[PDB]
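Hi R.,

Here are the chain sequences for the assembly we discussed:
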Amino acid sequence: SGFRKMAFPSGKVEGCMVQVTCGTTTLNGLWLDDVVYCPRHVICTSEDMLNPNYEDLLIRKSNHNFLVQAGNVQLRVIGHSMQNCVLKLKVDTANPKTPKYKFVRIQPGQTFSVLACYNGSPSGVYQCAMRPNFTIKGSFLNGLCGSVGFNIDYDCVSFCYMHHMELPTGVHAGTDLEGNFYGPFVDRQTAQAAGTDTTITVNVLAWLYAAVINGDRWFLNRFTTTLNDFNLVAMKYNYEPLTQDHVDILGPLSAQTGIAVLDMCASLKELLQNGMNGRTILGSALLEDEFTPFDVVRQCS
Amino acid sequence: SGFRKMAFPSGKVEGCMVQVTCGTTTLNGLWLDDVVYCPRHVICTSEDMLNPNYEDLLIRKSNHNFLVQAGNVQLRVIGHSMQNCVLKLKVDTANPKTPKYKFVRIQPGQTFSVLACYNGSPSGVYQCAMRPNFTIKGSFLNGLCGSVGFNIDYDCVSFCYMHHMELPTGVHAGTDLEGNFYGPFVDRQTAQAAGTDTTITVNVLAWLYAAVINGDRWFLNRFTTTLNDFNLVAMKYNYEPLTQDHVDILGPLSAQTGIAVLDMCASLKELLQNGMNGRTILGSALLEDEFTPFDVVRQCS
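And here is the predicted structure of the full complex:
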């Protein structure tokens, strides 16, 4: 039938985006209260990025080397500090548009919205997943460093990602808002390998439930299986192993559709082995894994 | 490789969404200056919708039957008026959050962002195309009547769509902001057929250019063709005919990639006839038609 990825409304985040320029390098910053968060690599020349000593580089910089703009306004940097891979630029003006917010570190396979920004100006909003190997796919953040990923729960913006770099493979890597990289990556222009990526099994199951809910059910069979038997097949097709926590997470969708989680696992098992025979599910010719069980519940209920 | 659909930042639209309740029916309204725009079918009972005389129904209603809420605020309806299929509720308070805006009527095959809203509260943002048959696919606006589609150019929000209804097939139908339906549809609960849908040829070509730009070029062949010869094949696979205006529209992408528009048409011709042989283009197993040439230019340049 049809099922679209949905991003959170970006309004609350838009009012926090600023421009941070240092030398010939301009990237995006996040302005929350009297602090502007941005990738520490803003201080690096192209040469510096090859093997930066950030401690030593940061020391040479002065406040007045950091040009922070919010629209047409110029915010004066009062003090600069480094927390892991993120720079914290203290300013004398609290952002009046600061929303209720938390910093959160998300798990692999979870989803969030990214407000893609160029030089402090919002350009667009994307929905994406953190891959099991802690990268983001889609070639949508190229040179848009400092753009942030988030989720909105009630009135609160939970910031979970800040874009730092493209790996040589083109995939995106970044940090949480405390500047800790997702995955084994470092903010240096060197060869770095992402792990083997795997398909997010729980998400694919969620999406199949979505398909049933939307009347697209051709793939449903009258088999069931055990987690153990299913996971043998999963490993073969580079699917993340399915846990009891995952099964527990899928309960509401199982209850809504009257399809036991392990029965849905049996239908996936058959799709993996036989393919889709030139057929589509929710208008897609492949199995989609960037919708969480929560995403499906929110959109389908 | 990878290429994600991007919605416009929704902030400017978020501040315009209101709740309009009439009887047991609650839907979304657009609050611009001292006017609230919403589907006229808000005044209809479930029974009324089967065959409404809107003129007669509107007459029975009074201002005080229209409950208009902006967050926790209650806006008093000063006067109510009907322009085609949209109700215009005059209020005594101008929206202080009114952005620079235009009302525009878009062409079939064009794209826009939809701020999906439930009862005046923004829930999410989607990117979509107006199908050649003047419907919207994706089952994302169900019961979210009054949600609006838009584009943002510079500082200006160009409103182009207001959601009214799902056709019995489940696809979405709606109007421009002057209340003129897109396509042959009416705001009545009766059987209505959408035209045969066709694939948006110019958009598919745009997306192939996108694929080349992102290093995914396996489908490129050393053939060319004429518009006439191509369009013979297109008609066979229910593709929109390609015009010189379309070719002219694709010029910048042709210039960026060094691939003549008619040469790209020849590669599409081959994809249509032979399929994709279990291969993907930009991570998709089918030919995507919801990215305009403009969308591709904005995202890839």
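Chain B touches chain A through 35 residues (CB under 8 Å). Helices of chain B lie at 11-14, 54-60, 201-213, 227-236, 244-249, 251-257, 261-274, 293-300.

Let me know if anything looks off.

Best,
T.
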